[PDB]
């Protein structure tokens, strides 16, 4: 019985570990980066173009 | 006569220009103050928003 249980759980843990490997490789470089809008106060009012 | 009419017209146009540009200068001062107050509000918003982004992260 212990052998049956070990074989089943070992196969399960082998698939579990192969699944972990992908997460181990990278974990953050999949998300995009920050580019929020803020500041810009110092820019001038009479734009060099007429969309002012 | 020609000088009399020219002087009347000159006085009226002078008065119109003077009132126009006194109003314009008063608007200049008032609009300066409005720009500065909205600019300070904007700066304050920028500090708040900076802290906001930090807290979000």
From Swiss-Prot, chain A:
Its PTM note reads: Phosphorylation by STK4/MST1 alters its binding affinity to TNNC1 (cardiac Tn-C) and TNNT2 (cardiac Tn-T).
What are the Phosphoserine sites (modified residues) in this protein? 8, 41
Task: State the disulfide connectivity.
Answer: none
Q: Which residues carry this modification: Phosphothreonine?
A: 23
Its subunit composition reads: Binds to actin and tropomyosin. Interacts with TRIM63. Interacts with STK4/MST1.
- Summary of the function given for this chain in its UniProt record: Troponin I is the inhibitory subunit of troponin, the thin filament regulatory complex which confers calcium-sensitivity to striated muscle actomyosin ATPase activity.
Tell me the protein family, please.
Answer: Belongs to the troponin I family.
Which disease is reported for it?
Cardiomyopathy, familial hypertrophic, 7: A hereditary heart disorder characterized by ventricular hypertrophy, which is usually asymmetric and often involves the interventricular septum. The symptoms include dyspnea, syncope, collapse, palpitations, and chest pain. They can be readily provoked by exercise. The disorder has inter- and intrafamilial variability ranging from benign to malignant forms with high risk of cardiac failure and sudden cardiac death.
UniProt-recorded name of the protein: Troponin I, cardiac muscle
Which species does this protein come from?
A: Homo sapiens
From Swiss-Prot, chain B:
**What is the protein named?**
Tropomyosin alpha-1 chain
Q: Which gene encodes it?
A: TPM1
Subcellular locations according to the entry: Cytoplasm, Cytoskeleton
Stretch of the intact protein here? 58 to 114 of 284
Q: How does it assemble?
A: Homodimer. Heterodimer of an alpha (TPM1, TPM3 or TPM4) and a beta (TPM2) chain. Interacts with HRG (via the HRR domain); the interaction contributes to the antiangiogenic properties of the histidine/proline-rich region (HRR) of HRG. Interacts (via N-terminus) with LMOD2 (via N-terminus) and TMOD1 (via N-terminus).
Tissues in which the UniProt entry reports expression: Detected in primary breast cancer tissues but undetectable in normal breast tissues in Sudanese patients. Isoform 1 is expressed in adult and fetal skeletal muscle and cardiac tissues, with higher expression levels in the cardiac tissues. Isoform 10 is expressed in adult and fetal cardiac tissues, but not in skeletal muscle.
Q: What is the role of the protein in this entry?
A: Binds to actin filaments in muscle and non-muscle cells. Plays a central role, in association with the troponin complex, in the calcium dependent regulation of vertebrate striated muscle contraction. Smooth muscle contraction is regulated by interaction with caldesmon. In non-muscle cells is implicated in stabilizing cytoskeleton actin filaments.
Q: Could you say which protein family the record assigns here?
A: Belongs to the tropomyosin family.
Q: Which organism is it from?
A: Homo sapiens
State the disease linkage annotated in the record. Answer: Cardiomyopathy, familial hypertrophic, 3: A hereditary heart disorder characterized by ventricular hypertrophy, which is usually asymmetric and often involves the interventricular septum. The symptoms include dyspnea, syncope, collapse, palpitations, and chest pain. They can be readily provoked by exercise. The disorder has inter- and intrafamilial variability ranging from benign to malignant forms with high risk of cardiac failure and sudden cardiac death. Cardiomyopathy, dilated, 1Y: A disorder characterized by ventricular dilation and impaired systolic function, resulting in congestive heart failure and arrhythmia. Patients are at risk of premature death.
């Amino acid at each position: 019985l212990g052998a049956r249980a070990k074989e089943s759980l070992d196969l399960r843990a082998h698939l579990k570990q192969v699944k972990k490997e992908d997460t181990e490789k990278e974990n953050r470089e999949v998300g995009d980066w920050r580019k929020n809008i803020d500041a810009l106060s110092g820019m001038e009012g009479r734009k060099k173009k007429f969309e002012s | 006569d020609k000088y009399s009419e020219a002087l009347k017209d000159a006085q009226e146009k002078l008065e119109l220009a003077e009132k126009k540009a006194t109003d314009a200068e008063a608007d200049v001062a008032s609009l300066n103050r409005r720009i500065q107050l909205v600019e300070e509000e904007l700066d304050r918003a920028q500090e708040r928003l900076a802290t906001a982004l930090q807290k979000l992260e």
